[PDB]
Design a protein around this ligand. Structure first.
Ligand code: HEA
Ligand code: HEA
Ligand code: FES
Lengths: 552, 54, 143, 139, 465, 93, 185, 67, 53
């Protein structure tokens, strides 16, 4: 025995070991890593945008910024957040784990993955390059209503760049979803059945289905808008019904654009619960049924953004939305029943999950409150809905993304992040977020609609904005400890070679070496249930697992 | 011919106080940079542009 | 006997797991210190083109015999210099290889042994090993 | 794969039900009568799911049982040679660069640059297609 | 340069005082059958010449053929480049329109008059007094037709003779060595290919000349000191001088009744650029301490330092050239003129090190990839299930194989190697049909076996010898 | 300089041309009928309409700019076709 | 191995996305059609029925020839495949020249893109169809060039088949659009 | 307002909480074991390290020592 | 074709807006097109003959 091993692995590696490999790549894992890096960078850009926002909004009156710059500013903030961070991070986690989760040696179309990645990067660079224009980028908000987006108003070049960036990003997303669907449907492990795969795969495939259902309509809409702007095609003229038509189509596309960014991270939290709960998933087939029900009905509730227009039939869409509320509650009940009466250990990923369910609970309560038409007749366009979507979107995406990173960092790099810095980061982000985004209900229900550059000293709320600014500034510096921890642990830190650093893992992923070689596999175990690695590592526990599977 | 409205932000270069005449200045044309003639004047910005090298 | 968590696979590879709250090295040394010694080892091995190994176990037997028995575990025993330290019995030894002879090997063992021994009385061992490896690498000439 | 076909046909049925209900409910009790905008989208997404399920059923009805479709199968059953996969390559980044150039051209109205972008797109597509079919140089 | 009246055929230019040379140019453009075609061909050919010489110099610099045996060839090439650039500058100035007049006025007058010591003497000698002279245009015409073309032709003949006597280099290969040359003889191939290439280049010149309008002087006007506009940015092979003039900060020195203007720094920079071009081989040979003969070139990825310096130079030239096109950048793309000027100014300093480091890393990575593909067989892109549960690449060995089936490591000889299976003969040469109808099977089989035998015989003859 | 630019006169119509000169819009020098004769305006608009609406007798036009687009065209068309013909005629080894 | 073909499902979902793109186009067209009463087409417009039907017959004949090429394709014959694909390519080129001539005729008699809403929506609907037909011709050219440069493999047959039913989908959407426009009106 | 007496809150509120959390958390104990002491016996199992840099049993020397 | 177009083409200036010429602008493009196509076809024939015979 007495095997010879290095005291440490290579910190950075040999010189010039990243550039050409990145350029001429075919590996899905590093593509997902690049996705994550680009998402982090765009998150930083938008975050500094928002910090400039909240420091301008406080101290009533125009201190150092003009109105048109402010308008362009929330245009860019909303666009970057909605269509250049979450959508690429979805495909990032896809490329990271989905071929690994299924057990497939490789993706269906390796070329198409790099194609989509580079298309998205180029589209983001083109769209974000509107600040160099002396007239600036587009001035309308991300809603992009009918009459302000024609040639008559906003004739600057920013709108064209915005539209083309959106088009390129949508095409890249379509190609990525097609790749994911093909890889899932065609390739699979030989002993693998569709009724035995982790819930994350079901969520990602229904998400890709919704992608293919939704995105092309945006492409047609933006082609028509560009045709109107450059040729005067009279498509969206006020003399016609284009005012209602464009809104109908745009909302029909964009409401699934936020429903697509919830299911995969629901799957992420669903697969992160059992490893720390030491219990099987709760309501497996029920979870699949609820996911399917959400996916199908997530497309016929688009009109509930039309309450203020008063030209659509209210009760039908109200009833549809109240129906779509139930399956989310079913998912939540499954998650909470999974961890009931268990040996739960408090580490960074499950703490982030706890914050996730807290924030999502509050956001869902606000949303189910929002569904009332007469209530929206007073609370629409106020800060109440602003807090609504901020709560839901941030609480799911940021928290689940950081939890998944904390989870799967050893799988991709073979190193473990420090837990003290993670706990400090989680606490500081949580404190800042519930401190800066709690009071806007009080500011919102009373008169203060969204997207205002100024107000008057006669009205109150001269201190609520101050509290919001304090909390936002606190949240702004909370990201730095995470960056320092990641940068330190990428080269230094604890090195793990034994499989499954978080013991009692599942989802077939913990049966291979922590540094995954090319094609990701050298051996395959038996497939008998949804926890194959767990049975492999503890073969003496099969009889007990099969015996008490229906106690209830 | 400058607008008679402002007539208050001029500088009257140290040795040429009386050279100007009301709404008249009569500047030369050969630019001192390379000698390219400059004929690009904006009335609102009071800026003279040299087309050869901006 | 396949410690809980370690299971033999179909091939010769062994898959092992660990409780999340624990590590997989259990080395009672500072991280930066181990990084520094590894850097010194690598930057000396690349220059000298000779494998160098460090052993910190006990040799409660004939030290020369045990040390020469261990050298077989080197990937290339023919060209390698092994330094072994036994803290319990205070044994410091250095051994040679077949190919690494006449390249300053003889003129390096006494100096490195003296340096390590002199650096071992103040309570530290890692800096002593670093100094010994540096002086022997300087003594060793390519050939 | 039959499970996937069943799911797709269920989605098609749900889309058809939603489309017909919306159409009949918008025919009456509407200020503007037929909406004529969302009805088309619902109808054709239902048609999409219908044709996809039909293609899957046609594939299913003329195919044998694969090991992954048979529970209890062993690993050596799937032993064999899989499809061809492209190793390290760099054409897609050039294709994406050409596409970005074309997008920039169609952004700001410059017909010469859009023509150049179209030509570059054609060249990049040609390079992508022939990357694994050009033989040795004839010399 | 005596003023005359047009009274020709172009109605929008009738009855305007104008120079005689511009009238002659208009006559050539409009009143002679096909004259405009010929002059457009001439201008397009001059641009072709400039681009071709630039590309050839770049390829020579990359291949590293400038070593001890052929240094004088490099010096002659530098002289050729400088003289050709000056001749091209004198080219577009004879039809003294607003564009040419403005360009020559600015460049020549400002640079010559800005000389610190001599200054006015050179300008007065060249122009015969003040800037607008009656002898300037005839002198420029004579210099453009007689002295520079003859000197250029003689020097080109000298360069061709030198490359004829000293045998041409060759890339490393299977049957290539530092004491022999591999190629083809003259009679059956070499001259015929040269003639075909000449015909093809004349064809592309004629086509693109007939399609693209160039220098529409009639749209312009006769040169006068009082007319000026955004018309700037002369021909693109001396555009770097204009960009350097644009981006330079305004530093000036004032001592006793004297003043040195900013453009003197531009003159110093262009003179140093002129000096460095022929002096590079001496610097390299006295820096690296190499005094060995070489008949074999090196592939670009082998030498990182020289490639990095080349990237340095080309990036500097590109950023300087694009800076001078600032106005069109701000026009076509709505960008601030001052912002673009500042971007160019800062980039001239900050961009070079970034691209230098990036290309150094790129060359190192290329060398690493070549070593990796040398170590193992080239990837076939095929995976196997391995019923025990593994996945393998199934490398195709390029030569000797050990007892284990893993090919033994080869050695690098500076020779290119295929990176794709289809590059080597695996499966090709489909049926003998032309486009719709197949041929007899015996004929196709005979053609296939004959081609395989011929290629194998050629490869064996090259490898053995 | 600094943002605003000079628009192309292609979409300009003669009445608006004369009126715009006489009006003095933003960044444009205002012109009085006293300093410029009416015949001068007629000649100016006649020349403007003739110059742009007349077919260029030199083939395809290249934007009316200087030689920078000409050099771009040389680099993108002449170079590409020339190197393609060189590769077709020559061989790689 | 690989009882199904991943190229098949990939092309199926890609055509599904394009079908939703045409769904969006149909949504643009049908909107505001009822907003005009009586003669909702502008009088300065009159569709030529004598020229629209021939191009539809051309396209359906091309689709049938493409199906014949497929039938030649599943068996070991490449030359008949090339002949059928060349016939289909020529037929589609004739079609393309057909709508180009129709385009030239239409604008010459009033209605243009900036003229009327009906003209704009009709032009927008037909332009994407024409562009996709041109893309299909490009795909034909690329595929036929690929056939003659190497050996025959099932991958080539898969590419031919997927291009074939992409063309069939193009034919179906074209006939649907024709029925919408020239018949229902 | 831009007054310093009210900008003090915006400046110092994050720093005080950051300091409190730092002294509460970072001051705790990490899982890294302490440095091995020479007086303490070598309870750790025997360990060896190899450079594994050069890519490609007989004894020709020896040494000894007792500190 | 080049010989014919050189002999019998209207090359005298008549360009204006009163009459639609549409032909005077097509002299130099036609000359260049014919010349380039002729000599390029010659070069293509030469290179093909060399490479196949
Ligand atoms: C990630 C993004 C995200 C998510 C997940 C959601 C989730 C929900 N949203 Fe939100 N929404 C947006 C982003 C999001 N939304 C955006 C960006 C806008 C407008 C953008 C713009 O116009 O500027 C918007 C606008 C918006 C409006 C219209 C506001 C306006 O235009 O005036 C409404 C109201 O109908 C609404 C409702 C809901 C509901 C009911 C949910 C539900 O999914 C959540 C409810 C979940 C719960 C947790 C309930 C679970 C069930 C139970 C626990 C059982 C008990 C429940 C009851 C009491 C019945 N959203
Ligand atoms: C995922 C989506 C997402 C995310 C993560 C965020 C993150 C944040 N948002 Fe944003 N926001 C939206 C989506 C999002 N937002 C949307 C959709 C709207 C409205 C849409 C519309 O109306 O048009 C909106 C609007 C919005 C408004 C109101 C805009 C308006 O009404 O005028 C405000 C301010 O009250 C705000 C604040 C914040 C803050 C403080 C964060 C914080 O969470 C961010 C913390 C991050 C950091 C601050 C990064 C740190 C920055 C630096 C330290 C960079 C420094 C380093 C460099 C120099 C490189 N957001
Ligand atoms: S002469 Fe004025 S900028 Fe050159």
């Amino acid at each position: 025995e007495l095997e010879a091993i290095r005291p440490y692995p290579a910190r950075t590696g040999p010189k010039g070991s990243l550039v050409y490999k990145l350029i001429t790549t075919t590996d899905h894992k590093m593509i997902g890593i690049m996705y994550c890096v680009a998402c982090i960078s765009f998150f930083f850009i938008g975050g500094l945008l928002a910090l400039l926002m909240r420091t301008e909004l406080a101290a009533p009156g125009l201190q150092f910024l003009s109105n048109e710059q402010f308008n362009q500013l929330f245009t860019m903030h909303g666009t970057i957040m909605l269509l250049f961070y979450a959508t690429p991070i979805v495909f990032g986690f896809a490329n990271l784990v989905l071929p690994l989760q299924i057990g497939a040696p490789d993706v269906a179309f390796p070329r198409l993955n790099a194609f989509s990645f580079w298309l998205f990067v180029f589209g983001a660079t083109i769209g974000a390059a509107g600040f160099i224009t002396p007239g600036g980028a587009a001035d309308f908000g991300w809603t992009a209503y009918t009459p302000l987006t024609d040639a008559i108003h906003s004739p600057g070049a920013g709108g064209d760049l915005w539209i083309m960036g959106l088009i390129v990003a949508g095409l890249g997303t379509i190609l990525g979803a097609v790749n994911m669907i093909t890889t899932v449907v065609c390739m699979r492990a030989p002993g693998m059945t569709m009724f035995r795969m982790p819930i994350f795969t079901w969520n990602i495939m229904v998400t890709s289905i919704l992608i293919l259902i939704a995105f092309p309509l945006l492409t047609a809409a933006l082609f028509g808008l560009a045709a109107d702007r450059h040729l005067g095609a009279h498509i969206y003229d006020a003399a016609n019904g284009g005012v209602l038509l464009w809104q109908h189509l745009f909302w029909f596309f964009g409401h699934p654009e936020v429903y697509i960014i919830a299911l995969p991270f629901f799957g992420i939290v669903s697969e992160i619960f059992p490893v720390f709960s030491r219990k099987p998933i709760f309501g497996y087939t029920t979870l699949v049924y609820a996911t399917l029900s959400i996916a199908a009905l997530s497309v016929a509730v688009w009109a509930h953004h039309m309450f203020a227009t008063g030209a659509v039939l209210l009760p039908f869409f109200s009833f549809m939305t109240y129906l779509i509320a139930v399956p989310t509650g079913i998912k939540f009940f499954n998650w909470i029943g999974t961890m009931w009466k268990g040996q739960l250990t408090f580490e960074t990923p499950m703490l982030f999950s706890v914050g996730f369910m807290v924030t999502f609970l509050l956001g869902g309560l606000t949303g189910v409150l929002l569904a009332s038409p007469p209530l929206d007749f007073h609370v629409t366009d106020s800060y109440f809905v602003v807090a609504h979507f901020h709560y839901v979107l941030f609480g799911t995406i940021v928290f689940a993304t950081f939890a998944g990173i904390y989870f799967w960092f050893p799988k991709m790099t073979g190193r473990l992040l420090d837990e003290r810095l993670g706990k400090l980061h989680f606490w500081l982000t949580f404190i800042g977020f519930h401190t800066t985004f709690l009071v806007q209900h009080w500011l919102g229900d009373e008169g203060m609609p969204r997207r205002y550059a100024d107000y008057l000293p006669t009205d109150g709320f001269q201190g609520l904005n101050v509290v919001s600014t304090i909390g936002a500034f606190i949240l702004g510096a909370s990201m730095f400890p995470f960056v320092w921890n990641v940068f330190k642990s990428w080269r230094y830190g604890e090195v793990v070679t034994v499989d499954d650093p978080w013991g009692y893992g599942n989802s077939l992923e913990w049966a291979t070496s922590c540094p995954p070689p090319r094609h990701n596999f050298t051996e395959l175990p038996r497939i008998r249930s949804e926890r194959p690695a767990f049975e492999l590592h503890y073969p003496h526990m099969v009889e007990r697992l099969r015996a008490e599977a229906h106690v209830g | 011919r400058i607008k008679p409205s402002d007539l208050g932000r001029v500088v009257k270069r140290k040795g040429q106080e009386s050279f100007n005449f009301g709404e008249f200045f009569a500047f030369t044309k050969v630019c001192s940079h390379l000698g390219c003639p400059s004929s690009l004047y904006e009335q609102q910005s009071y800026r003279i542009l040299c087309p050869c090298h901006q | 006997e396949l410690p809980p968590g370690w299971v033999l696979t179909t091939s010769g590879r062994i898959s092992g797991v660990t409780e999340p709250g624990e590590l997989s090295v259990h080395y009672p040394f500072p991280i930066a210190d181990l990084v520094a010694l590894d850097d010194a080892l690598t930057y000396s091995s690349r220059a000298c083109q000779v494998r160098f190994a460090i052993y910190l176990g006990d040799l409660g037997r004939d030290t020369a015999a045990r040390a020469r028995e261990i050298l077989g575990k080197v990937p290339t025993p023919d060209n390698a210099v092994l330094l072994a330290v036994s803290p319990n019995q205070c044994a410091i030894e250095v051994v040679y290889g077949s190919q690494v002879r006449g390249r300053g090997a003889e003129s390096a063992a006494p100096l490195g042994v003296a340096a390590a021994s002199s650096a071992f009385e103040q309570g530290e061992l890692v800096d002593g090993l670093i100094s010994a490896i540096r002086v022997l690498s300087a003594g060793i000439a390519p050939g | 794969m039959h499970i996937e076909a069943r799911l797709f046909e269920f989605v098609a049925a749900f889309f058809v039900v939603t489309a017909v209900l919306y159409g009949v409910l918008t025919s009456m009790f509407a200020t503007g009568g037929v909406e004529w905008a969302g009805t088309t989208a619902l109808a054709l997404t239902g048609g999409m799911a219908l044709i996809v399920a039909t293609f899957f059923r046609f594939v299913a009805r003329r195919l044998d049982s694969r090991p992954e479709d048979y529970e209890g199968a062993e690993i050596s059953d799937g032993a064999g040679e899989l499809g061809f996969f492209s190793p390290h390559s760099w054409w897609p980044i050039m294709v994406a660069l050409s596409g970005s150039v074309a997008a920039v051209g169609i952004a700001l109205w410059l017909p010469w640059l859009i023509a150049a972008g179209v030509a570059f797109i054609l060249a990049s597509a040609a390079g992508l297609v022939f990357e694994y079919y050009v033989g040795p140089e004839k010399h | 340069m005596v003023d005359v009246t047009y009274n020709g055929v172009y109605q929008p230019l009738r009855g305007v005082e104008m120079s005689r040379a511009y009238q002659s140019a208009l006559d050539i453009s409009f009143e002679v059958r096909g004259g405009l075609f010929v002059r457009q061909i001439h201008h397009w050919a001059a641009l072709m010449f400039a681009a071709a010489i630039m590309v050839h110099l770049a390829r020579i610099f990359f291949t590293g053929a400038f070593r001890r045996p052929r240094e004088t060839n490099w010096v002659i090439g530098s002289l050729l480049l400088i003289l050709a650039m000056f001749e091209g500058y004198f080219g577009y100035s004879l039809p003294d329109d607003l564009l040419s007049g403005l360009g020559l006025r600015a460049a020549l007058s400002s640079i010559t008059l800005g000389m610190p010591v001599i200054g006015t003497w050179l300008h007065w000698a060249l122009f015969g007094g003040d800037f607008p002279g009656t002898i300037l245009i005839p002198r420029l015409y004579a210099l453009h037709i007689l002295l520079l073309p003859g000197i250029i032709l003689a020097l080109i003949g000298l360069h061709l003779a030198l490359v004829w006597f000293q045998k041409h280099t060759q890339f490393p290969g299977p049957g290539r060595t530092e004491h022999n040359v591999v190629g083809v003889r003259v009679m059956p191939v070499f001259a015929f290919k040269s003639g075909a290439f000449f015909a093809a280049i004349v064809g592309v010149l004629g086509l693109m000349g007939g399609l693209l309008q160039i220098n529409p002087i009639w749209n312009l006007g006769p040169y006068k000191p009082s007319q000026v506009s955004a018309g700037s940015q002369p021909d693109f092979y001396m555009m770097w001088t204009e960009g350097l003039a644009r981006i330079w900060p305004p530093w000036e020195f004032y001592f006793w009744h004297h003043t040195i203007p900013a453009p003197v720094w531009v003159a110093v920079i262009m003179g140093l650029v002129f000096v460095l071009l022929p002096a590079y081989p001496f610097l390299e040979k006295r820096f690296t301490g190499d005094y060995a003969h070489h008949n074999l070139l090196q592939r670009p990825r082998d030498v990182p330092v020289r490639t990095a310096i080349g990237a340095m130079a080309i990036a500097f030239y590109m950023v300087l050239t694009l800076a001078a096109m600032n106005d069109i950048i701000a026009l076509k793309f709505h960008i601030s003129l001052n912002a673009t000027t500042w971007i160019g100014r800062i980039g001239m300093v900050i961009l070079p090190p970034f691209v230098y480091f990036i290309t150094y890393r790129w060359c190192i990575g290329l060398q690493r990839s070549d070593r990796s593909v040398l170590e193992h067989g080239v990837e076939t892109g095929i995976i196997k299930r391995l019923p025990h549960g593994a996945y393998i690449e199934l490398h195709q060995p390029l030569g000797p194989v050990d007892e284990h089936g893993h090919p033994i490591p080869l050695q690098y000889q500076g020779a290119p190697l295929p990176k794709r299976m289809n590059k080597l003969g695996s499966a090709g040469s489909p049926g003998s049909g032309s486009f719709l109808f197949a041929d007899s099977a015996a004929e196709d089989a005979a053609l296939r076996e004959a081609g395989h035998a011929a290629e194998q015989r050629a490869l064996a003859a090259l490898r053995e010898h | 300089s600094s943002g605003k630019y000079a628009p192309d006169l292609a979409p300009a119509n003669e009445q608006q041309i004369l009126t715009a000169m006489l009006t003095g819009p933003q960044n444009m020098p205002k012109f009085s009928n006293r300093q410029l004769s009416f015949e001068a305006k007629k000649d100016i608009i006649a020349y403007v309409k003739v110059a742009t609406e007349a077919r260029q007798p030199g083939g395809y036009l290249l934007g009316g700019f200087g030689p920078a687009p000409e050099g771009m065209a040389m680099w993108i068309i002449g170079m590409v076709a020339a190197i393609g013909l060189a590769l077709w005629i020559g061989a790689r080894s | 191995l690989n009882r199904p073909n991943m190229v098949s499902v990939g092309t199926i979902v890609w055509l599904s996305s394009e079908l939703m793109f045409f769904a969006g186009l149909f949504a643009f067209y049908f909107s505001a059609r009822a907003q005009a009463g009586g003669n909702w087409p502008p009088p300065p417009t009159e569709l030529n029925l004598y020229q629209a039907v021939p191009v539809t017959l051309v396209l359906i004949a091309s689709s049938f020839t493409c199906q014949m090429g497929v039938f030649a394709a599943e068996r070991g014959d490449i030359f008949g495949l090339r002949r059928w694909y060349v016939i289909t390519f020529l037929m589609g080129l004739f079609f393309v020249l057909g709508q180009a001539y129709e385009y030239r005729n239409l604008m010459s008699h009033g209605t243009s893109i900036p003229s009327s809403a009906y003209g704009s929506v009709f032009y927008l609907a037909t332009g994407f169809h024409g562009l996709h037909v041109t893309g299909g011709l490009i795909a034909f050219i690329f595929l036929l060039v690929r056939t003659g440069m190497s050996k025959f493999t099932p991958a080539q047959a898969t590419a031919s088949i997927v291009v074939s039913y992409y063309w069939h989908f193009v034919d179906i959407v074209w006939i649907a659009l024709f029925t919408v426009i020239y018949f229902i009106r | 307002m831009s007054a310093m007496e009210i900008h003090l809150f915006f400046v110092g509120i994050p720093l005080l909480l950051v300091v409190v959390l730092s002294v509460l958390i970072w001051s705790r104990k990490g899982p890294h074991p302490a440095t091995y002491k020479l007086s303490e016996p070598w309870t750790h199992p025997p360990i060896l390290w190899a450079a594994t840099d050069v890519v490609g049993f007989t004894v020709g020397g020896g040494a000894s020592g007792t500190w | 074709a080049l010989l014919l177009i050189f002999l019998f083409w209207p090359w005298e200036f008549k360009a204006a807006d009163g009459e639609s010429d549409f032909i005077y602008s097509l002299t130099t493009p036609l000359y260049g097109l014919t010349f380039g196509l002729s000599i390029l076809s010659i070069a293509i024939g030469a290179v093909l003959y060399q490479k196949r015979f």
